[PDB]
Design brief:
Layout lengths: L1 H9 L10 H14 L6 H16 L3 H5 L18 H9 L9 H19 L2 H5 L1
Helix pairs in contact: 2-3, 5-6
């Protein structure tokens, strides 16, 4: 209860709340982004914590119905990952300042941007 209330107010990313369809849309890309790259310790901590939070609020089925959204594919069957738009999503992610999730959120964002470099706002209003 205590640490989940802290983590829900740490990943609000919107105005309505942690249960709104816009926040559930923007968490989907992060959970999808995680499952989609190299298994990091910070990435799997963020994944398990979002999973615990969606179990608590009664949205576990909506967690297990996650995939990449339609605003990151080029074709439905041809699984293509629009990395430039995804980098714009991660770069425009309003990560909060409250400890201890600000440091972890910032390091998560840095290693995701760094790993997509090593391979080579409007988003939440859309989804």
């Amino acid at each position: 209860e205590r640490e989940t209330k802290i983590f829900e107010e740490a990943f609000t990313f919107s105005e309505n709340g942690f249960i709104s369809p816009e926040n559930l849309g923007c968490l989907e890309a992060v959970v999808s982004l995680i499952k989609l790259l190299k298994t990091n310790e910070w990435s799997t901590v963020i994944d398990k914590c979002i999973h615990i939070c969606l179990i608590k609020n009664g949205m576990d089925h909506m967690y297990h119905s996650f995939d990449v959204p339609k605003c990151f594919m080029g074709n439905p069957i041809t699984r293509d990952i629009n990395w430039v738009m995804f980098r714009e999503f991660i770069n425009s992610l309003p990560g909060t300042d409250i400890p201890p999730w600000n440091v972890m959120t910032e390091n998560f964002k840095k290693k995701c941007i760094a790993l997509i470099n090593s391979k080579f706002s409007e988003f939440t209003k859309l989804m």
